[PDB]
């Protein structure tokens, strides 16, 4: 039993980590197959930060302007073979294969999904923790200069799941990155100017999941035969600065597991808001909404009689 | 910027897992040079774990009577050469030395230092976290079973303090493990029995360092001028369940930072403790006790 902030084991990520230098600029970097992605602002003088012509600057670089290094676990001499900027990253293609390429995919994560980050300064795994694309694509994460190049990931199976690479810090305790299309998250800019960061959200359907460990870990002081419709907390949610609430089969079977139905937990949700009545929930006074369905499926597996 | 749970990166501990078969039984390990460490009751079969007979069990088993096999990275079969029972662990002597053997050294965590925790099943790593030993030499982690044999360890430097085995589970949500000597912390017993537990505390100087992280966050308004002495905050933490603070270099450097004493956090403890009354310090309504003062100086300052 139990429920605590989990990350996936970095290991196999960590053997595809490289250290990424344009100049007298160090970023980290992910070397899959003869292919190694950086953010695109390794490239940029500290001085131009401000207002960094990106297209100008990939003119100026040859191949020869890059290097890439590996630390620690396994030696590696990487030649740049050549280089192309897509989005906000940087494609370098490099001389050899990483012999740790593990089967991967890249995908563009909602808000509201969790992944692991592999925190890395110099090409170096420093350390790991999970967090979530907030409904303001942002993420809540710990990143100081120089973790730009840092991956975010989720596994399933033997499967590594990119979805996520470092690149700025817009507030404090506040983060945003990539995706590995190129895209940033949310459409910021990697320009250190002044941008709109809109309002942070609840994510209901990762409180909903929490209540459900709760229950399953014999807290289940808020549940009351009080019901709240999904189209009704929906419409309240929209007020109160709550995402919209959407049933997934992950959530139903958390529903069967405890017989507690979504609707229960969608009002308590409601009353919670407006305090625990210096009650505890898991060892919190405060709605947790960064574990998500799936993830509570994980912790608290078991056994089903049927 | 930010505070988050962190854990070290688990590669290097990941190459030293194993699985541990005994009869109808399966655990996990420690491979590290020529030694397997395991806990002891993957000997008890699957109805005896509420008194087992450890003497009986020990004498009852053989070298064949353990499979050990490596899954992640190179798969390999290993051949256990001798066993020997240390405590509550066992410690399997197998043919192969580890290939993948870090820098390593055993120590025996003290109540309020936190260590990571590679979770596995099979011998397969399934995740990662952080806890801290608490003051009633507990744990709480996210544990099920079959994750016996999961190792806690920090990283110091290059080298591996490998500091916890996993063991049980004594209540909900809350678990405890052996020290690599054996040694079970907080003297449970490895018998599938109700065993009572002390009475908890708050980690005096990881709230201190978590008050010196929500300040370099931009979180300082339970900062006031009024200090309680280390002497005055130790005689009321006595009588308040909190443990006794003792400063260290790490907690200094937090305090040269951000230029707040010490004992103006005791203070802010002292009327923290009776509840926040609506406030919340770094998105949290309570105290938070799991944050050392070298994880924050880590995460904020990078040191
Ligand atoms: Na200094």
Known sequence: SGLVKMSHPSGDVEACMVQVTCGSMTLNGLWLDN????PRHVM???????????????????????????????????????HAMQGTLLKLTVDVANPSTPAYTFTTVKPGAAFSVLACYNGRPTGTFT????????????????????????????????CYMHQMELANGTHTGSAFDGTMYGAFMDKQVHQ???????????????????????????????????????????????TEFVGTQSVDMLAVKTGVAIEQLLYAIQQLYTGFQGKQILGSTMLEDEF???????????????
């Not at 302007?65 to 630390?71: L, N, R, T």
């Open 292 to 306: 998500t369905p799936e993830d509570v499926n994980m912790q608290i597996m078991g056994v089903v009689m049927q």
């Open 35 to 38: 292919t190694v992605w950086c």
């Open 131 to 162: 967090v979530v694309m907030r409904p303001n694509y942002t993420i809540k994460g710990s990143f100081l200069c120089g973790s730009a190049g840092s991956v975010g990931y989720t596994k399933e199976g033997s499967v590594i799941n990119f």
């Open 196 to 242: 709109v960061q809109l309002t942070d959200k609840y994510c209901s359907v990762n409180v909903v999941a929490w209540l459900y460990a709760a229950i399953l870990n014999g807290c289940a002081w808020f549940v009351k035969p009080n019901r709240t419709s999904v189209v009704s907390f929906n419409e309240w949610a929209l007020a109160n600065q709550f």
């Open 44 to 82: 940029c003088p500290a001085d131009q930060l401000s207002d960094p012509n990106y297209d100008a600057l990939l003119i100026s670089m040859t191949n020869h302007s890059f290097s890439v290094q590996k630390h620690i676990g396994a030696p590696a001499n990487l030649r740049v073979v050549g």
